[PDB]
């Protein structure tokens, strides 16, 4: 449960999504980040209100059920089986499977995951996720994340997701990352083009 | 400025009158003396400083020859050091107004011939002289001389 920040890297106005991904991972290989594996994020929507089922690679035994403004469930992987057991009350709502695939770089307690958002065959955007391991309280280490994002994003540097905006000493949780991913995926689905 | 301007206008209007301080006295001394009571109840020494602080390697003395007790001064130094070899004495011409300018090394090419080793001393010394910053001291010249002797010992062997 370290503080994370998820953002959309824009298209760059030219070239492929793969070339901009090559640019970002090249900058990361400059700064001293090392590859430590790959990562995948899956999101599907289920309807009778909409519910989302999401899977991270980082929490491989967990599945997250996101009710868009309601509460989040975290459960083990057998939750997927329950949806197949539901199957009449909650239809699968196909042509809305969405994934991000990429490599995860670690640079001194910073985890940077740069993925290509792929609705079916076509890749339609770049997701960038930066997790800061040690900090556990949102909006306190935010300036650290801002300097790291200003170091390698440069321009298009995001600012302050609304999950931070609940201004307390609230401990950040793993549900907030999947909330940010769900907001990003909805923005990319509405972006479409 | 504010709250003080008309005094400033009066006094700046009335400067260059020869009776000015008379006017100030007549207008100000009785008030103050009533309130406050009555009034109240050969060689330039920069070179001596350099020579007094030199390392005991160098043995700087004045030339018996040359003009003395006048503008510029002239020095014949020496070098004593077990590590370094005996070398030609070196002649320096320190100008008057010594700081803010650089002293001059009186060149004697003829004694720096007749050996390969003294030739290497001389070449290396002219090199470090070209490398020097401007308005250097005497001790910069003497230390480039000692470093030149050391490099010419090392380059030879």
């Amino acid at each position: 449960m370290g503080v994370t920040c998820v953002s959309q890297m824009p298209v760059a106005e030219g070239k492929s999504v793969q070339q901009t991904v090559e640019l970002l991972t090249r900058k990361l290989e400059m700064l001293g980040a090392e590859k430590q594996g790959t990562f995948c994020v899956d999101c599907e929507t289920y309807h009778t209100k909409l519910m989302y089922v999401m899977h991270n690679s980082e929490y491989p035994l967990s599945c997250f059920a996101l009710f868009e403004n309601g509460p989040c469930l975290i459960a083990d992987t057998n939750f997927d089986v329950l949806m197949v057991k539901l199957k009449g009350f909650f239809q699968s709502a196909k042509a809305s499977k969405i994934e991000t695939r990429g490599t995860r770089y670690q640079y001194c307690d910073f985890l940077v995951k740069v993925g290509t958002v792929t609705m079916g065959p076509s890749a339609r955007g770049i997701s960038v996720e930066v997790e800061y391991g040690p900090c556990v309280v949102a909006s306190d280490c935010w300036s650290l994340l801002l300097e790291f994002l200003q170091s390698f994003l440069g321009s298009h540097t995001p600012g302050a997701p609304a999950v931070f905006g609940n201004r307390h000493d609230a401990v950040y949780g793993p549900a907030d990352t999947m909330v940010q991913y769900m907001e990003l995926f909805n923005k990319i689905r509405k972006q479409q083009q | 400025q504010y709250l003080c301007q008309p005094l400033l206008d009066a006094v700046l209007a009335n400067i260059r009158s020869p009776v000015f301080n008379h006017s100030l006295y007549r207008t100000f001394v009785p008030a103050m003396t009533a309130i406050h009571g009555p009034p109240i109840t050969s060689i330039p020494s920069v070179l001596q400083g350099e020579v007094a602080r030199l390392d005991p390697k160098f043995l700087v003395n004045l030339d018996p020859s040359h003009c003395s007790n006048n503008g510029t001064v002239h020095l014949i130094c020496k070098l004593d050091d077990k590590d370094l070899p005996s070398v030609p004495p070196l002649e320096l011409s320190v100008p008057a107004d010594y700081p803010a300018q650089s002293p001059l090394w009186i060149d004697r090419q003829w004694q720096y011939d007749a050996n390969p080793f003294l030739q290497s001393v001389h070449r290396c010394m002219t090199s470090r002289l070209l490398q020097l910053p401007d308005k250097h001291s005497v001790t910069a010249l003497l230390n480039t001389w000692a470093q030149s002797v050391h490099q010419a010992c090392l380059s030879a062997a």
Binding site: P134, V137, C141 | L3, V11, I15, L24, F28, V29, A31
Partner: protein, 267 residues
């Protein structure tokens, strides 16, 4: 409150300054123009002095007005003893500071045993102050007390004492499990992150640094005072380079005696 004391003493000196500056204006005008070689030079000197004196009067008046904006609102034997007590206390504070900075003691020689109840009283006394630090003593192995000092949502420090004198410290992050499988303290672990291993190293230098020979209460109190300054991790920038991050590290060095943030590479 003390701010009214300081503002009143300030404005006292402001009135004295205003009065003396007005009298200085009129005294320098009494003497008249001096001689000063060059005629242009004497005119310049007189004009400059008069202008400076007038400006000083204006500044003093402005300062008095600013203090006005900021101001807020047998028996003699007792007051004499009160004044003499405050005088002796301040005198003794200054003389004690000057003398313990320069001691001439070279060796203790000329010509540890404590009840654990005393340790618990001392550490509870430290835990009563610093309301953001909670210290939880336990003794799993004998008389050597082990302390969990949690610190905000930032740190969990495991301090291993030995007869009321700090011996070892391990700094771990907030979420990190400091407990073993059996729920005892994990006295021997590291913290999976670069930052908290750096802070363990700095804490070991802190316990090597704050060493009085005999009295250990000042040692533990000063160590907790230094440790309290780490609550502004991830928020304080370095006081040498300005930035937050050098090689992906926050400024992990809170300097002793002036608790300022530095990256340890910036010493």
């Amino acid at each position: 409150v003390s701010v009214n004391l300081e503002a009143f003493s300030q404005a006292i000196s402001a009135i004295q300054a205003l009065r003396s500056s007005v009298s200085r204006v009129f005294d320098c005008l009494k003497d008249g123009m001096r001689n000063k070689e060059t005629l242009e030079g004497r005119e310049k000197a007189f004009i400059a002095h008069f202008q400076d004196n007038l400006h000083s009067v204006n500044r003093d008046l402005n300062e008095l007005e600013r203090l006005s904006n900021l101001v807020g609102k047998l028996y003699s034997q007792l007051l004499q003893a009160y004044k003499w007590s405050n005088k002796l206390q301040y005198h003794a504070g200054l003389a004690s500071g000057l003398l313990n900075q320069q001691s001439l003691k070279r060796s203790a020689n000329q010509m540890l045993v404590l009840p654990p109840q005393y340790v618990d009283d001392v550490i509870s006394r430290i835990d009563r102050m610093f309301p953001e630090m909670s210290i939880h003593l336990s003794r799993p192995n004998g008389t050597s007390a082990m302390l969990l000092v949690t610190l905000g949502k930032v740190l969990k420090v495991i301090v291993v004492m030995r007869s009321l004198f700090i011996d070892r410290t391990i700094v771990k992050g907030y979420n990190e499990n400091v407990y073993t499988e059996d729920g005892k303290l994990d006295i021997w672990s590291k913290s999976n992150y670069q930052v908290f291993q750096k802070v363990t190293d700095h804490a070991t230098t802190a316990l090597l640094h704050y060493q009085l020979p005999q009295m250990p209460d000042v040692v533990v109190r000063s160590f907790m005072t230094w440790l309290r300054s780490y609550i502004k991790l991830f928020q304080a920038p370095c006081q040498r380079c300005g930035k937050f991050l050098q090689d992906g590290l926050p400024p992990t060095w809170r300097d002793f005696r002036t608790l300022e943030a530095f990256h340890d590479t910036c010493r």
